[PDB]
Amino acid sequence: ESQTYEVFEKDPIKYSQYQQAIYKCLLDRVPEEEKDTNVQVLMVLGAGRGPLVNASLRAAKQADRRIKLYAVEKNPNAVVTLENWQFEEWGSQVTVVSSDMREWVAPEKADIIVSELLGSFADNELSPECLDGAQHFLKDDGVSIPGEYTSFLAPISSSKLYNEVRACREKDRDPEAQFEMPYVVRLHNFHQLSAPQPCFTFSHPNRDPMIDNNRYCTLEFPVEVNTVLHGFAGYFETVLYQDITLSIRPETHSPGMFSWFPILFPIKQPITVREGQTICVRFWRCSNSKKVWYEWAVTAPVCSAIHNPTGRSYTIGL
């Protein structure tokens, strides 16, 4: 919706980082002697109402380098915003495209692609799949912003949040469906039992033959207190270019930014954990041609059931 894009745009720290990220990449790719010879082909993949288009314009001006912008956006309601802006403000430098990036047949290859396809668990908006499908129209020496992102997990004890999830039971579905799906939540009344550890990582452009975005990750969390595990808080980090990063991981959290709340993977049954014991969690990223989903299971100190098998309770639409 419009007001969903509005609240995204009301985060100036994020776009200043995107501005700075592109700014540097322009300087690296284009030398001083080729300032007015080389025009860089930028392609905002998922332009929305065009905060990046703007940021790309600011970045090019502070860098003092020439750019040619595309603005690919599938949402046709947002494309109305883009075209009105483009007519009034931007002009012919920005070419608004109303298409899926996986489908779009590009008339030109890009030097840079810029995207904003990251959720609270990074890859939960299928940034891997979209950017893989948009990879063909990147130059062989082309850059992706972001170039990398990683998801983190940490076990939590919260009798409040457990009881909150419990109360999301709905008619006409599985009685325990609510436990087999992640939630975006400002975690407040909870206890982080162990330090966050990396779960899934993705690099763009992906150069691994037969690119597979399916994953399986085992994590062991050393617990130093007695407690009762109720779920796993999820965070993420992303590298835009080099030393330009965004993060919602508590220890490396970008200061001031408020564009992503943490995500919560619950479990059906609470699990008691003695001091000295290790919480062992297993996380799968699964997919078919239509859907992508996560499954997860606790294996220590006791086994849980595998959550969300075959994405029965939760899928992410391709």
Binding site: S2, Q3, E6, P76, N77, V80, W85, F87
Partner: protein
């Protein structure tokens, strides 16, 4: 006192339009989301690949303005139940597009017309939109008391108006509504915007609309009489109807141009206010009852339970 809005089918500048409407005391504005005449192709080339923006930007108003002050309108050219297959298919795609844009803006309500008997494919498309995503946006079905065919002037030489008392035939606009909402399976998002005509029908035709979800009552400017002072008023027939409608607490919409050119457009609204103040006040019953209108509560069992 009374909640009133303004219907327009011409908005050259959205910001300026609201200002005028708001200055006249109206609470909200019914207007198109795409230009009424801007007919769009979705199948045949080359018109389907028409460049440029399809409508106004959402940035022209604040999010809150869209959410509280604007009511969407389906464009008049959209006819989903057309006999021509091309116009049907085009109207389908266009209807979804306009409805989706309405949801994008986060409009509180959206107007769709019931101006004929068969609105099956209209209902099928709307139902699909309702079951796509999640939204609380209401849908006000524009339905007249008296069908346009039945209030036309008897000025066609070889086609005179029906001068016969057809009891069932004069209730046809209710049957239009009934069938539509049945197809849609009594969606709580679908309500009535009852359009009042110049000549009110028989009493039974009006009683038909008792117990129906009337959210709006559209009042044309044409139906207003003029008094000795030279300002808009209504007949004693219409007055009794408005008095009934005030009990239901509907939102009165004004549509059409200013026929009372000498006076302001506020005069129309001021008359509804005049009527609002001039009603029999709520008795002790209705004073206390005000709040529990059609609120379902479980019967008390002071034997089984302790009160």
């Amino acid at each position: 006192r009374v909640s009133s809005g303004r219907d327009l089918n011409c908005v050259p500048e959205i910001a300026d339009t609201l200002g005028a409407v708001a200055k006249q005391g109206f609470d909200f504005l019914c207007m198109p989301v795409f230009h009424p005449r801007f007919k769009r192709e979705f199948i045949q080339e080359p018109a389907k690949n028409r460049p440029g923006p399809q409508t106004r930007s959402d940035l022209l108003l604040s999010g809150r303005d869209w959410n509280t002050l604007i009511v969407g309108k389906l464009s008049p050219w959209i006819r989903p139940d057309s006999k021509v297959e091309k116009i049907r298919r085009n109207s389908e795609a266009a209807m979804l597009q306009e409805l989706n844009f309405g949801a994008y803006l986060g409009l509180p309500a959206f107007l769709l017309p019931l101006n004929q008997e068969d609105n099956t494919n209209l209902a099928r498309v709307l139902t699909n939109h309702i079951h796509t995503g999640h939204h609380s946006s209401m849908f006000w079905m524009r339905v007249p008391l008296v069908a346009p065919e039945d209030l036309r002037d008897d000025i066609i030489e070889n086609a005179p108006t029906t001068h016969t008392e057809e009891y069932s035939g004069e209730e046809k606009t209710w049957m239009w509504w009934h069938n539509f909402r049945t197809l849609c399976d009594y969606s709580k998002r679908i309500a009535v915007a009852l359009e009042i005509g110049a000549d009110l029908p028989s009493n039974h035709v009006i009683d038909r609309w008792l117990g129906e979800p009337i959210k709006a009552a559209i009042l044309p400017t044409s139906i207003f009489l003029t008094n000795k002072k030279g300002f808009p008023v209504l007949s004693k027939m219409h007055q009794r109807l408005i008095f009934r409608l005030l009990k239901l607490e509907v939102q009165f919409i004004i549509t059409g141009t200013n026929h009372h050119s000498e006076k302001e457009f506020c005069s129309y609204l001021q008359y509804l206010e005049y009527l609002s103040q001039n009603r029999p006040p709520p008795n002790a019953y209705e004073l206390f009852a005000k709040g529990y209108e059609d609120y379902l509560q479980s019967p008390l069992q002071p034997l089984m339970d302790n009160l």
